[PDB]
From a paper:
Because of the hinge-like motions between the different regions of the SC, we carried out focused refinements on distinct sub-regions to generate higher quality density maps. These focused refinements were performed on the peripheral arm of CI, on the membrane arm of CI and on CIII2, resulting in reconstructions at 3.8–3.9 Å resolution and improved atomic models for each region of the SC. In contrast to the isolated ovine CI (Fiedorczuk et al., 2016), subunit NDUFA11 (B14.7), the traverse helix from ND5 subunit, and a few other peripheral areas of the complex were well ordered within the SC, confirming the stabilizing role of CIII2 on CI. On the CIII2-proximal side of CI, the four-TMH-containing subunit NDUFA11, which directly interacts with CIII2, is shaped like a lipid-filled arch, contacting CI with the ends (springers) and CIII2 with the top (crown). The dominance of lipid-mediated contacts between CI and NDUFA11 may explain why this subunit is so easily lost or disordered by detergent when CI is extracted.
Residue numbers in the entry:
A (entry chain D6): 1 to 80, 85 to 175
B (entry chain D3): 1 to 26, 50 to 113
C (entry chain A1): 1 to 70
D (entry chain A3): 10 to 83
E (entry chain D2): 1 to 347
F (entry chain AM): 30 to 143
G (entry chain D1): 1 to 199, 217 to 318
H (entry chain A8): 1 to 114
Write the structure that this text describes.
């Protein structure tokens, strides 16, 4: 309910990554990655971020986690939580809270960097008169400039199809 | 964040509804597997295609015509490949 | 026949008739009788920002035209 | 022949073959390129006064410059 | 496994290596490594044993995390001075992550735990193509980004690669694990020179690829996995014996034979700096990694192990394979000592 | 009736294409009129933009000259950069010490309006 | 007033779902010869509201103490998708003027597939779980076809903005330049609503999610291919004719629900891939290659 | 480094064109017709030298040209220009195709008396 | 230094450790690799958005389509491993020894 | 090796994605355009080491354009001094909306 909304969504993003990086059951991992992908889409849309951030949400949370949970469920289940997972989640939460505290009550945080501690509404553009939605025209390339690029991308996709059928018993 | 306001209001409405509904009672097939991966690959090529209508105006329309037809023609090549090589059957 | 089923379809269509009319009524009611200014691009938003700045009431519906020149 | 075996596939190949061939032979592709080129997104900038060009007209009403007319002329 | 499909997959391996070589943009470097992975997985599992399945699994996990670490280093590079050119980097952390990604990509001693395992459970054609192309293609990228590397990275990984690929290797009777440990030793020998003169690195790459092609061709002529099978190939045919002799002694790096041109020219353009303790340490470890070559030779063609019969039955049927290119590569790999001024073929 | 149904389907299809072509060309005429609007309108808005950002810069430098008189070093209008060019400000040079409402209306206003 | 706009969106949809249940049951009763039932309530309305409160107050026979988190997240996700996804649908002036909304519709359809998978996993390792896995497959194999067809019918809009769609649909409709593509899209909507011919608790809430998804796809149909001319300073006319076309298409959706047998799953996947997917490719490449033929590329503003 | 130089508010005060966006969008083409002969000096200044705090004099000149144009459209024909911009005002995003009758009225007016 | 970059790089290191240390499963490891992919996607996309570097906005979409087909290959390999066994543990891969 | 069939065939497949200040699809600039134009025109025909020792100033200028490190440092010090003197109790400040 304040200005630091990109920071708050980044904090819940790191919350979700820890929440499935503590190695749970893989369907709970898929749930945690769904939460992380939703709030990361929120981050990239708050930088705006109109086209591409919701574009990938159709793929990343529209075409990937379905197959992930699919092959999760039909391969194995192992119906039983464990103390090591809860301990790793507590250590991840403690690392999160310690980084937040040393961003709040200090100036800079060094891993080997100098992060200026304030929610970045700045830097940001000074409202330039587009009238063409810059990133949409960006992705509206690949077709008048992307000669070699879409050729090798579609080529690798065709090879992906033939690789999948060969490994799953070509022909 | 206004759609976040809408989403939060509807999530709270649905959550209060479900909590009232629950706190007031008063093997495997490989043929199943290939459909998901085939979905995955063709949906990735959909993600390549679908920024075409944002692209529909430019200086070089023939290059866009050529590469867009190459994209859909490769999609048809892969589909017809697994069609002829008896993959997606039962 | 269908002489008796048209009341059910009619009331369900009225249930599909209220929300767009209420939304259009609230858009006309919450902008001083104006249609709501959409902002697809950065240009229309900058033009809307100077609109809400030259109001004085910090509200972009008044639009105070042509009698502010003299 | 093949029309009775798999008809929808043959119809798809036929409409696909006209989708490949047909954009060459057309009286409208150069019109498409002209319509698509001649829409100004950014500002057409002024430039330095004279190299004594018989072009670059000093007034936007002056007809000495390359303009479009075939929008209105069908 | 249709021949059209194999021609397509080998053409995609060629295309991945060409896209690695030819581009001036980081996205095509990542796409080249990635397409090389995606194409080199079904050269493995040409059989259907679970050995090849688990080997392709191990290779996929290590190769893919190396690719993701590479992409992390490139995104840090664009966080700093922002352009997608293949040149000097602008962060020691980014160059650190990138050299560790390429070190996992082609094998160093903290990273080599996938190499003998993935070479054990695959046939010899897949091992040949993965060794040659997967150790060829990232050397181009290191050759392009050499002016911006912290030296302790490359040199610690190279020293450790030579000594671990030496020490691990005196305890394997399998053929493929011997060849994999030899690959690790030669990756170390190429990497240690890279900040000094990279012509030596590319020439050592050419020599090691020709040597490995001769080695795997002399194992493709007669299906062997252990040294006992090598002694039975002593019994069936005599020319395979002397060529295993000469190519093993040229893997060892002895002066009249053409495996000494890589080591000694590296010694030259290493010691025209003031580094002397590092050449003598590397070359004593080059004395060390010759012993398993020498016991291999004692098994094959110098002593003679007693052979089972049915060689009496195998004598009627001559070795009617086709070799890829055995005699040309043999005489070019072993008789190429006095053409050391073909060093300057390369600039 | 199969040939006749095919014929009437292709006829209705071609009629739809012809009408859609005509309406899209008139639509392109109207979009070129919109471009004329933004072109002829622009320099007045550019002048107002320049005056407003120079006004906030002079105000904020005077604010800094008040607020930092108790520190060593610190000249009042220190260019961070070395070359003497008008670099575009970063909205932190512009919208600083404003406390909340106006900076949320100006920075993130377009992103979560409409 | 914006939360009041939210409430005036989300209050009529629940009444819309329950009265859709009465309308579908009584129009089955006046297609198939069962002239009724209408005794409970005058013309049958108190029977749907009592059916809603009956599914509210029903004795549980309670099996449901298994995997609390998944069992509380599957119906909540299905209902929040089905109840939030009329926001970009442009009943005359939409609730949020999203710059791109049809891709947002497709993303929420895939999240509904996630909720189906979560209920299938919460169905406790069963032949019902295998049937739910087949339902996931026959729901996921049509978001290819629906997205590609949607792409080609918005290629005549030029932009995703959907107000440009209501601009394009004034002279003629979008059924005439694409009738086979709209036919295949309608069949894809029959597949995505998971109903005939294409086939634990709270069953009432997954029921709610199904029917709100159907009315979403019908309103999205009526915007996408049909409609009337919008008039400013008179939105009520567009509301009238839009509601009439959506109601007629929903009754025709019932009219196809009644009179067809179900399909075997082999025939369903064979049908999808080997009949729709090359024909979608061919119609889509022809709708790509047509604006270069007719000098009509649509104005992305 | 060398500190920045900014003009103070002894110079950065021209009487602004205090009309809103609707009428300023509606009056575009005639603003391009009579005026906007000397604005291209301003715009050429801005595009050649990438420095505002340099071309502000020509910004003052284009601002007084716009204010004189609107004073001339207030003095002469006509009064239903108010009708024209209040007709284009409530039409959502300003299409030039909705209120075209009064555009024809305004064109006949301006051809009659200006 | 755009503070959100700090927590997103932190999330990258979190997902990297989740990839590297992993117990008795491969689906969770591949899913953490997918999370690391998402981290690279978000980080590169915030960079390209704030820098207005418009022509090379192909990096996020091409990064994600290529690493998505990587994930598809990994799922096919996991299905092959679980086909030649009963389960898909990190255990029972103990053959083909070093 | 760094083969240059890229340059031999005369195909600009990889010289447009590569750097800033190229030809964008609509002819638009970048955020730090002129900084890279001056830096590249400083270090064009230079052997990448005296390019370090001579074109360093414009490179640091471009880096502080890109990340804006020191400018955010200055803004942060301004806000911290603002906080300590408003806690001390001098001039509850009317620079916003007034003087
Ligand atoms: C979980 C988050 C789910 C977000 C779903 C996607 C919503 C969406 O697309 O919102 C778009 C809207 C801005 O619309 P856009 O298309 O970016 O147009 C440019 C300016 N109108 O964007 C917005 O209204 C703001 C972006 C989302 C902010 C809230 C994130 C909450 C988490």
């Amino acid at each position: 309910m304040m200005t630091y909304i990109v920071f708050i969504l980044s904090i819940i993003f790191v919350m979700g990554f820890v929440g499935f990086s503590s190695k749970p059951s893989p369907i709970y991992g898929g749930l945690g990655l769904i939460v992380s992908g939703g709030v990361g889409c929120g981050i990239v849309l708050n930088f705006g971020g109109s086209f591409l951030g919701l574009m990938v949400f159709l793929i990343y949370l529209g075409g990937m986690m379905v197959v992930f949970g699919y092959t999760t469920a039909m391969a194995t289940e192992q119906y039983p939580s464990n103390k090591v997972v809860l301990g790793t989640f507590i250590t991840g939460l403690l690392m999160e809270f310690l980084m937040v505290y040393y961003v709040l009550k200090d100036k800079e945080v060094e891993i080997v960097f100098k992060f200026n501690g304030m929610g970045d509404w700045v830097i940001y553009d000074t409202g330039d008169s587009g009238f063409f939605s810059e990133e949409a025209m960006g992705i509206a390339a690949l077709y008048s400039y992307g000669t070699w690029l879409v050729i090798v991308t579609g080529w690798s996709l065709l090879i992906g199809v033939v690789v999948i059928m060969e490994i799953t018993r070509g022909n | 964040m206004n759609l976040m306001i809408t989403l939060l209001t509807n999530f709270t409405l649905a959550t209060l509804l479900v909590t009232i509904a629950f706190w007031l009672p008063q093997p495997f097939s490989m043929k199943f597997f290939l459909v998901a991966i085939t979905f995955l690959l063709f949906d990735l090529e959909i993600a390549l295609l679908l920024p075409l209508p944002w692209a529909s105006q430019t200086t070089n329309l023939n290059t866009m015509l050529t590469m867009a037809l190459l994209l859909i023609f490769l999609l048809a090549v892969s589909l017809a490949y697994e069609w002829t090589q008896k993959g997606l059957e039962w | 026949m269908w002489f008796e089923v048209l009341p059910g379809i009619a009331v369900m269509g009225v249930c599909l008739f209220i929300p767009g009319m209420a939304t259009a009524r609230i858009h006309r009611f919450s902008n001083g009788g104006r249609e709501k200014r959409v902002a697809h691009y950065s240009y229309q938003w900058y033009l809307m920002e100077r609109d809400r700045r030259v109001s004085g009431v910090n509200r972009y519906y008044v639009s105070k035209g042509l009698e502010n020149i003299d | 022949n093949v029309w009775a075996k798999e008809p929808v596939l043959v119809a798809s190949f036929a409409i696909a073959g006209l989708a490949v061939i047909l954009p060459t032979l057309s009286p409208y592709t150069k019109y498409s390129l002209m319509i698509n080129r001649a829409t100004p997104y950014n500002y057409p900038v002024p430039l330095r006064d004279d190299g004594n060009m018989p072009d670059v007209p000093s007034h936007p009403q002056d007809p000495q410059g390359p303009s479009l007319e075939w929008l209105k002329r069908l | 496994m249709n021949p059209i499909i194999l021609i397509i997959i080998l053409m995609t391996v060629m295309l991945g290596t060409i896209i690695v070589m030819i581009s001036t943009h980081w996205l095509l470097i990542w796409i080249g490594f990635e397409m090389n992975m995606l194409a080199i997985i079904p050269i493995m599992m040409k059989k259907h044993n679970p050995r090849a399945t688990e080997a392709s699994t191990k290779y996929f996990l290590t190769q893919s995390t190396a690719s993701m670490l590479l992409m992390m280093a490139i995104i840090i590079n664009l966080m700093f001075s922002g352009q997608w050119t293949v040149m000097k980097l602008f962060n020691p952390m980014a160059s650190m992550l990138m050299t560790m990604a390429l070190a996992m990509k082609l094998g160093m001693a903290p990273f080599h735990f996938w190499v003998p395992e993935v070479t054990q459970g695959i046939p010899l054609s897949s091992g040949l193509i993965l060794l040659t192309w997967q150790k060829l293609a990232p050397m181009s990228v290191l050759y392009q980004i050499l002016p911006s590397i912290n030296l302790d990275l490359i040199l610690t990984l190279s020293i450790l690669s030579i000594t671990i690929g030496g020490w691990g290797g005196l305890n394997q009777t399998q053929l493929r694990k011997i060849m994999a440990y030899s690959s690790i030793a030669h990756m170390g020998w190429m990497t240690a020179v890279l900040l000094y003169n990279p012509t030596m690195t590319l020439l050592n790459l050419i020599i090691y690829i020709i040597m490995t092609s001769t080695m795997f061709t002399l194992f493709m002529a007669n299906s062997t996995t252990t040294t006992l099978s090598l002694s039975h190939t002593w019994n069936k045919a005599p020319i395979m014996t002397i060529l295993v002799l000469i190519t093993l002694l040229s893997m060892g790096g002895l002066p009249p034979l053409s495996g000494f041109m890589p080591k000694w020219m590296i010694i030259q353009e290493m010691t025209k700096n003031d580094s002397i303790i590092l050449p003598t340490l590397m070359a004593i470890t080059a004395l060390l990694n010759l012993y398993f070559y020498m016991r291999l030779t004692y098994s094959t063609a110098l002593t003679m192990f007693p052979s089972t019969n049915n060689m009496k039955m195998k004598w009627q049927f001559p070795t009617t394979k086709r070799m890829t290119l055995l005699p040309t590569m043999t005489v070019l790999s072993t008789m190429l000592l006095p053409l050391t001024p073909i060093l300057s073929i390369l600039e | 009736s199969g040939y006749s149904m095919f014929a009437v389907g292709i006829g209705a299809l071609l009629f739809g294409y012809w009408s859609m072509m005509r309406w899209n060309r008139e639509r392109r005429r109207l979009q070129i009129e919109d471009f004329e609007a933004r072109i002829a309108l622009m320099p007045l808005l550019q002048a107002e933009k320049d005056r407003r950002v120079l006004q906030m810069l002079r105000e904020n430098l005077e604010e800094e000259a008040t607020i930092m008189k108790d520190v060593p070093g610190w000249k009042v209008g220190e260019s961070v950069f070395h070359t003497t060019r008008w670099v575009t400000p970063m909205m932190g040079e512009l919208y600083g010490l404003r406390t909340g409402e106006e900076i949320l209306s100006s920075t993130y206003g377009f992103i979560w309006y409409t | 007033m914006f939360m009041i706009n939210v409430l005036t969106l989300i209050i009529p949809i629940l009444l819309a779902v329950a009265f859709l249940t009465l309308v579908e049951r009584k129009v089955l009763g006046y297609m198939q010869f069962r002239k009724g039932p209408n005794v409970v309530g005058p013309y049958g309305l108190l029977q749907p509201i009592a059916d809603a409160i009956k599914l509210f107050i029903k004795e549980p026979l309670r099996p449901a103490t298994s995997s609390i988190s998944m069992f509380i997240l599957a119906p909540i996700l299905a209902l929040t998708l089905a109840l939030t996804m009329w926001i970009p649908l442009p009943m005359p002036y939409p609730l949020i003027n999203m710059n791109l909304g049809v891709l947002f519709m497709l993303a929420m359809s895939s999240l509904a597939v996630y909720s189906i998978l979560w209920s299938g996993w919460a169905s406790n390792s069963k032949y019902a779980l295998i049937g739910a896995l087949r339902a996931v497959a026959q729901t996921i194999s049509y978001e290819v076809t629906l997205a590609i067809i949607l792409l080609s019918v918005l290629l005549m809009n030029g932009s995703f903005t959907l107000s440009t769609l209501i601009i394009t649909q004034e002279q003629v409709w979008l059924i005439f330049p694409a009738w086979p593509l709209a036919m295949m899209w309608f069949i894809s909507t029959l597949a995505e609503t998971n109903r005939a011919p294409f086939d634990a608790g709270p069953f009432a809430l997954f029921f709610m999610a199904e029917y709100a998804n159907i009315i979403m796809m019908n309103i999205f149909t009526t915007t996408l291919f049909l409609g009337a001319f919008h008039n400013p300073y008179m939105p009520e006319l567009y509301t009238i004719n839009f509601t009439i076309k959506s109601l007629l298409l929903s009754i025709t959706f019932l009219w196809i629900r009644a009179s067809y047998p179900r399909f075997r799953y082999d025939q369903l996947m064979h049908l999808l891939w080997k009949n729709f997917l090359p024909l979608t490719l061919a119609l889509c490449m022809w709708h790509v290659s047509l604006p270069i033929l007719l000098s009509s590329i649509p104005p992305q503003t | 480094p060398g500190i920045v130089e900014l003009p103070s508010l002894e110079d950065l005060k021209v009487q602004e064109v205090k009309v809103s966006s609707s009428v300023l969008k509606a009056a575009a083409h005639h603003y391009g017709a009579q005026c906007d002969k000397p604005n291209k000096e301003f715009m050429l200044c801005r595009w050649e030298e990438k420095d505002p705090r340099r071309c502000l004099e020509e910004g003052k000149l284009v601002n007084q040209c716009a204010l004189e144009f609107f004073r001339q459209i207030k003095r002469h024909c006509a009064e239903p220009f108010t009708e024209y911009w209040t007709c284009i005002d409530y039409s959502g995003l300003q299409l030039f195709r909705r209120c075209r009758k009064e555009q024809a009225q305004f064109d006949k007016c301006v051809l009659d008396k200006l | 230094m755009s503070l959100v970059y700090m927590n997103i790089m932190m999330a990258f290191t979190v997902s990297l450790t989740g990839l590297l240390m992993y117990r008795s499963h491969l689906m969770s490891s591949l899913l953490c690799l997918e999370g690391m992919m998402l981290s690279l996607f978000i980080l590169a996309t915030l960079m390209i958005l704030n820098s207005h570097f418009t022509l090379a906005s192909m990096m996020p979409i091409i990064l994600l389509v290529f690493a998505a087909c990587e994930a598809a290959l990994g799922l096919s390999l996991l299905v092959m491993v679980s086909n030649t066994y009963g389960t898909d543990y990190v255990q029972n891969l103990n053959l083909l020894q070093c | 090796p760094f083969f240059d069939v890229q340059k031999k065939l005369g195909v600009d497949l990889d010289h447009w994605m590569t750097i800033q200040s190229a030809e964008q699809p609509h002819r638009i600039p970048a955020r730090c355009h002129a900084f890279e134009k001056e830096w590249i025109e400083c270090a064009h025909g230079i052997g990448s080491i005296r390019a370090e020792k001579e074109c360093k100033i414009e490179f640091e200028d471009f880096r502080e354009c890109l990340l804006r490190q020191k400018t955010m440092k200055r803004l942060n010090a301004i806000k911290r001094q603002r906080d300590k003197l408003i806690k001390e109790g001098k001039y509850t400040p009317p620079p916003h909306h007034s003087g």
